[PDB]
Design a protein around this ligand. Structure first.
Ligand code: CDL
Ligand code: CDL
Ligand code: CDL
Ligand code: CDL
Ligand code: PC1
Ligand code: ATP
Ligand code: MG
Lengths: 161, 105, 108, 74, 256, 231
């Protein structure tokens, strides 16, 4: 065995923690390091459903806390009336009215349907790629049939003489 | 070095676990990936690529590791009239005619 | 003048052919040394590079090797016309004749 | 307090460059940041020190006047 | 001679024509051989992109103007246009129209300098179409086996012989032009298939065509000669003879 | 597995699977010499020679950091050709691209070479990383051979060679030891050898033959869960 090379080139400005070039993959790793891994719960019921009475207390505590702190809550309610009416009457059709009136506006639905089909393709990735290889394995085995014929030529020549 | 029993499978395949009541409600969303290391595993991109130049190039690399393989490589690259190293057999013309020239004796 | 060879710095040497018999031997050794060349012994002076598994891009790599061995500076306009062993021999002759007559290298 | 904060925010930019030195230096897509970071840093330092230096001169002009004017009135 | 020339070693006759999609310039000039990692300088110094644009775009553009500075030294560009600009510059504060009338002759001067200092570019596809129609050339040369050994094409300085071209002894034309707008050069060719070489010498001049004021062809080959050399055969092909060409057509005498 | 059912999936307003000339309103229209005064166009006939020079540049400027590795230079050439042969082999009719496919691909490769000249192209950094891991594994095999020791790859081959002899000594009715049978023998050894890397072989039980490894285990005291709560 020949002695291989000691090492290839080592870039002086590229590291695994500080990659030189940018992509969403490295941002994805730094993102999941930040939010941390999936917080797996070992319990048999969720935290919210087991503490509905207690969460109701603190929920109303902070409502009263804000209510006791906000002496002028009626001024905030009245100052919010006009924008509440305005933005809801203006955006009603584009949010909800389109579903039973003049136009459907199915742009957002088309993107869900495309993703649902892509989700299904990824679910059958193993089956689809395995069917593609079976055709390539069929072609590869068809080429290997020639070496099997030549190996027996010596036996044919021996018995022919 | 020890190899164990060829008839048996790894113990990971034989170990099992069963459930009971109560059962954890939590449904796993993703597989954990705490350390980004996937060494000694080949890329899954190398899946259904057709035959190409990398096949005869890597063949010579592995053949040249043996004595008989070194003879095949040197003979093919020198004494075979082919316009490509991507050898495809679609006929037995060169095979049959090479046999009739040898079986006469 | 020095280049890395398998991790070791080795001084590169240049050739000066100035003879028809030496140019043919160099080109054959050049083309046979290429890892994509098929039927290396069937290669002769009148051999089309296409018949030995070589395309337009392989002629660029061969022309690049001629610049390494002979010190030429071959323009991009000349490379695509080198498709036979005879073409490399005649081009090398034309470059030596040009420098022997004009005292300078051809335009690159 | 203002001069000390803005000095620390400028030092924070120097850390951001040092933390990302290899990208700012080798990646040519960040060449403009590499070339013009010191120009902006000098302009930022120039504003921090200018305000401090001008305030220092005015305080000294104020202190020397009230002392001189007070002795005249005495 | 090519006016636009950088330290790049390859493709000298195409340097001004090729429009690269580079954001900035390459770190090094095109290598002539495989180099070592320590031959080139990692992370080029700060303000490298600005330096490259000055030495690869600005500087060779000024060397082009300097090389052909003799074609812009006419009494129109030297005295009339700057003299007109100074007359209106004295009233630049009176109104806006004086600023425009003082800057227009400057922009007009730049355009004449910009066009006259460019490399003389003939329609090379017309030329190769002409030499490949000759049977004596196609016997030894073909487009698929021809290669360029040397190229030269430059304007002729001053006014020519005032017997072969009496057109240029015109005081009105000499006021705008200091040269004759004619060019001369050659082409060193070689054929890798036949082993033959030839020197394609040519002389060009602008001619009028089919219209009253517009030039027909700025580079018309009125003399085209080929000295073909082979193994033991030396042929001399005359595609366009000047004695027969100058009796039919005369130069154009560009103004402005 | 799963096939796209929409028969109009590859339909475009320009035809079936047309990704070379998408249909837009401002369509290309001809020009006439007699009627045209002036024109501003950037198209020329310089793309062919720019295609040749770009290859020479990208090939030579990358070999600068190969340290003379001959096998890496030949591997890079095969990879560089796959990048230049895209317009010649693609399903897309590259000769029918909207405004000249030759110019478009040439300008695309120039952007790649610009990054190559600075040794910052992601293909270059990927080649250095892949080659360093490969040479480290070849140097490991070389240092074990210089010591007279047997490599892990040689022990697999010798173990596979003896299993073939055992399986063919019992195969007398049939005499076709197909490549299918050889493969499943090697794959079964591979699965046990792969599981043996995480759990080495201590005794006759072999690689990953201990049931006690799969009993309840806990993190060591010096390496607790760093990212989340344990309870
Ligand atoms: C000095 C004295 C004062 C201090 C004293 C100390 C007091 C400290 C108080 C803290 C209390 C302990 C903290 C424990 C955790 C927080 C409490 C909790 O409920 O979390 C469990 C709950 C999930 O627990 P789980 O059951 O284990 O999860 C199982 C499934 O995975 C969950 O998902 P699933 O879909 O699979 O399962 C069903 C799911 C269905 O429920 C949901 O999934 C909720 C859907 C909402 C998500 C939709 C997207 C909207 C949010 C996007 C992100 C916004 C934030 C980021 C953007 C801005 C960046 C700043 O869960 C439920 O069944 C119902 C959930 C609970 C009832 C509804 C909760 C309403 C109030 C909580 C949210 C408060 C919002 C802000 C209001 C406060 C003003 C700031 O967490 C949440 O749902 C989100 C809340 C995250 C915490 C933020 C709020 C912290 C403080 C909350 C205090 C109590 C509420 C006070 C206000 C009440 C107003 C009405
Ligand atoms: C050229 C476009 C129109 C221009 C006219 C002016 C603008 C329209 C104003 C009135 C709107 C009514 C028509 C609904 C249009 C909905 C289109 C839509 O929203 O996109 C959905 C669409 C996908 O959602 P989709 O659910 O599949 O759409 C189907 C619809 O849901 C529904 O499915 P569909 O198949 O039935 O839709 C086909 C489309 C067919 O449209 C056409 O083919 C156009 C007609 C041919 C050309 C005629 C115009 C000729 C112009 C030249 C003459 C101008 C002279 C000016 C002076 C000369 C100047 C030199 O709509 C019609 O059928 C129109 C017939 C109207 C029925 C009238 C029946 C009687 C009603 C009586 C009561 C009326 C009460 C109305 C209350 C007030 C209005 C709310 O998104 C896109 O296509 C994105 C690309 C945008 C396309 C180009 C821009 C067109 C305008 C789109 C809005 C802005 C999008 C961009 C921003 C996106 C966010 C960043
Ligand atoms: C509710 C609590 C509220 C409390 C308030 C405080 C909240 C906490 C704040 C925490 C954030 C600040 C952290 C401060 C230090 C804390 C210790 C620590 O970092 O964690 C342990 C940390 C380990 O982190 P880990 O979480 O365990 O794991 C790291 C991961 O594995 C991955 O490793 P990795 O290295 O990639 O991770 C880096 C890691 C830690 O990386 C570090 O090494 C921390 C370096 C922080 C320096 C911040 C700028 C200071 C500039 C230096 C000034 C020196 C003046 C000296 C004057 C006299 C000398 C001439 O993360 C950071 O970089 C944190 C930086 C936070 C962003 C700051 C950017 C500010 C820009 C925006 C301006 C905002 C205005 C405020 C600016 C205030 C400036 C004073 O330990 C180390 O990193 C050891 C480092 C040993 C070598 C460093 C030798 C010194 C080199 C200094 C840089 C020189 C730059 C050029 C000079 C510029 C001025 C001329
Ligand atoms: C403290 C540190 C910083 C200090 C900074 C300040 C210092 C700056 C220093 C600047 C001075 C040195 C730079 C120039 C050195 C050149 C020396 C030399 O020997 O060159 C000879 C060299 C000849 O080379 P050669 O081929 O070896 O000669 C062979 C034979 O001798 C050739 O034989 P030939 O018979 O063919 O003769 C050829 C020759 C013929 O030469 C001549 O015959 C001389 C003609 C000059 C005419 C100038 C007046 C034009 C108007 C007269 C009109 C009078 C009639 C009408 C009167 C109406 C009154 C309203 O051609 C020329 O060289 C003339 C070229 C153009 C010159 C005229 C440029 C006009 C600019 C107008 C604005 C002036 C502002 C000045 C600043 C004052 C205010 C701040 O020519 C050159 O190298 C040309 C260089 C490039 C042209 C430079 C001219 C300036 C261009 C800049 C454009 C902007 C102008 C200013 C505009 C500002 C307001 C917008
Ligand atoms: C009166 C005192 C002097 C007045 C101030 C003069 C300032 C002139 C410089 C600032 C304006 C420059 C214009 C920028 C926009 C164009 C960029 C450009 O030039 O591209 C080059 C272009 C490059 O050509 P291109 O842009 O068409 O592209 C080349 C084609 N490819 C890409 C295919 C290769 O060339 C030219 O335009 C011709 C030369 C123009 C010369 C520019 C001005 C030089 C002036 C020299 C003054 C020297 C004395 C002063 C300094 C002395 C030392 C202190
Ligand atoms: N038929 C045309 N239609 C549209 N634009 C054109 C046309 N011909 C030229 N152009 C543009 O005008 C420029 C000059 O054309 P020109 O013929 O001088 O180029 P050239 O490279 O010198 O050709 P040649 O090699 O034959 O001499 C071209 O770069 C092009 O952008
Ligand atoms: Mg031209």
């Amino acid at each position: 065995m020949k002695k291989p090379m000691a090492k290839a080139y080592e870039h002086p400005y590229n590291s695994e923690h500080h990659p030189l070039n940018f992509s969403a993959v490295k941002i994805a790793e730094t993102f999941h390091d930040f939010i941390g891994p999936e917080q797996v719960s070992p319990h048999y019921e969720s935290f919210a459903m087991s503490r509905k009475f207690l969460l109701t207390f603190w929920g109303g505590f902070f409502v009263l806390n804000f209510g006791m702190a906000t002496v002028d809550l009626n001024w905030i309610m009245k100052s919010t009336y006009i924008p509440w009416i305005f933005w809801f009457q203006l955006m009603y059709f584009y949010v909800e009215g389109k579903n039973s009136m003049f136009m459907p506006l199915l742009q957002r639905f088309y993107r869900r349907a495309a993703a649902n089909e892509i989700f299904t393709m990824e679910a059958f990735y193993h089956e689809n790629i395995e069917n593609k290889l079976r055709n390539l394995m069929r072609i590869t085995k068809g080429q290997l049939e020639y070496w099997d014929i030549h190996t027996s030529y010596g036996e044919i020549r021996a018995d022919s003489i | 070095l020890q190899w164990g029993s060829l008839a048996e499978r790894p113990m990971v395949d034989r170990v099992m676990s069963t459930s009971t009541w109560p059962v954890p409600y939590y449904q796993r969303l993703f597989k954990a990936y705490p350390i980004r290391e996937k060494k000694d595993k080949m890329s899954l991109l190398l899946s259904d690529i057709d035959i190409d130049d990398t096949n005869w190039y890597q063949a010579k690399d592995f053949l040249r590791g043996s004595f008989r393989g070194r003879q095949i490589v040197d003979y093919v690259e020198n004494n075979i009239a082919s316009n490509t190293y991507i050898l495809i057999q679609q006929d037995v013309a060169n095979m049959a005619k090479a046999y009739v020239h040898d079986i006469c004796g | 003048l020095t280049q890395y060879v398998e991790g070791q710095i080795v001084n590169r040497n240049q050739l000066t052919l100035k003879k028809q018999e030496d140019i043919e031997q160099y080109v054959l050794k050049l083309v046979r040394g290429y890892f994509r060349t098929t039927n290396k012994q069937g290669l002769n002076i009148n051999s089309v590079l296409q018949d030995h598994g070589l395309d337009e891009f392989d002629s660029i790599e061969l022309a690049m090797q001629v610049e390494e061995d002979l010190g030429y500076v071959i323009s991009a306009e000349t490379i695509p016309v080198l498709n036979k062993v005879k073409h490399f021999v005649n081009y090398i002759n034309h470059v030596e004749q040009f420098k022997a007559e004009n005292g300078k290298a051809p335009i690159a | 307090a203002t001069a000390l904060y803005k000095s620390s925010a400028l030092a924070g930019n120097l850390f951001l460059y040092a933390y990302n030195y290899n990208n700012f230096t080798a990646n040519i897509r960040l060449r403009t940041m590499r070339y013009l970071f010191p120009v902006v840093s000098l302009a930022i330092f120039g504003n921090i020190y200018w305000d401090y230096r001008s305030q220092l001169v005015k305080v000294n002009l104020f202190d020397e006047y009230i002392q001189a004017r007070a002795q005249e009135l005495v | 001679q090519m006016g636009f020339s950088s330290d790049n070693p390859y493709n000298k006759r195409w340097e001004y024509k090729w429009k690269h999609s580079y954001y900035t310039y390459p770190r090094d000039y095109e290598h002539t051989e495989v180099r070592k990692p320590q031959d080139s300088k990692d992370v080029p110094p700060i303000y490298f992109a600005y330096y490259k644009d000055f030495v690869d775009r600005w500087l060779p553009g000024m060397n082009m103007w300097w090389q052909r500075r003799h074609r812009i030294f006419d009494k129109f560009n030297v005295y009339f246009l700057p003299g007109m600009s100074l007359f209106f510059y004295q009233f630049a504060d009176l109104a806006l129209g004086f600023k425009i009338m003082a800057a227009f002759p400057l922009f007009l001067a730049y355009t004449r300098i910009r066009d006259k200092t460019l490399d003389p570019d003939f329609k090379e596809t017309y030329l190769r179409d002409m030499i490949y129609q000759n049977p004596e050339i196609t016997k030894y040369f073909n487009e698929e086996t021809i290669h360029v050994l040397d190229y030269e094409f430059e304007y002729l300085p001053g006014y020519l012989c005032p017997e072969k071209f009496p057109e240029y002894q015109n005081k009105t034309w000499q006021f705008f032009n200091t040269d004759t707008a004619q060019a001369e050069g050659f082409f060193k060719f070689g054929d890798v298939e036949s082993g033959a070489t030839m020197t394609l010498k040519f002389k060009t001049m602008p001619i009028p065509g089919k219209f009253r004021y517009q030039v027909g062809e700025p580079f018309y080959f009125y003399d085209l000669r080929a000295e073909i050399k082979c193994d033991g055969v030396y042929k001399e092909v005359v595609l366009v003879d000047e004695k027969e060409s100058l009796k039919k057509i005369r130069p154009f005498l560009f103004l402005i | 597995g799963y096939k796209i059912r929409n028969k109009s999936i590859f339909w475009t307003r320009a035809g079936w699977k047309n990704n070379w000339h998408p249909k837009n309103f401002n369509a290309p229209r001809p020009s006439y010499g007699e009627f045209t005064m002036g024109i501003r166009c950037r198209n020329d006939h310089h793309s062919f020679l720019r295609y040749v020079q770009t290859y020479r540049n990208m090939s030579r400027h990358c070999k600068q950091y190969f340290l003379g590795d001959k096998q890496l230079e030949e591997t890079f050439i095969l990879g560089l050709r796959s990048l230049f042969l895209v317009p010649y082999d693609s399903q897309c009719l590259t000769d029918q691209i909207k405004h000249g496919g030759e110019r478009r691909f040439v300008d695309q490769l120039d952007r790649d070479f610009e990054l190559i000249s600075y040794n910052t192209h992601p293909y270059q950094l990927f080649t250095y990383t892949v080659r360093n891991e490969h040479l480290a594994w070849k140097n490991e095999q070389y240092e074990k051979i210089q010591k007279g020791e047997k490599t892990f790859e040689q022990e697999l081959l010798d173990y596979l060679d003896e299993q073939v002899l055992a399986e063919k000594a019992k195969l007398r009715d049939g005499q076709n030891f197909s490549i299918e049978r050889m493969t499943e023998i090697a794959l079964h050894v591979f699965r046990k050898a792969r599981a043996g890397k995480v759990r080495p072989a201590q005794d006759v039980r072999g690689p990953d033959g201990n049931v006690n490894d799969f009993l309840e285990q806990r993190r060591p005291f010096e390496h607790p869960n760093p990212t989340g709560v344990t309870h």
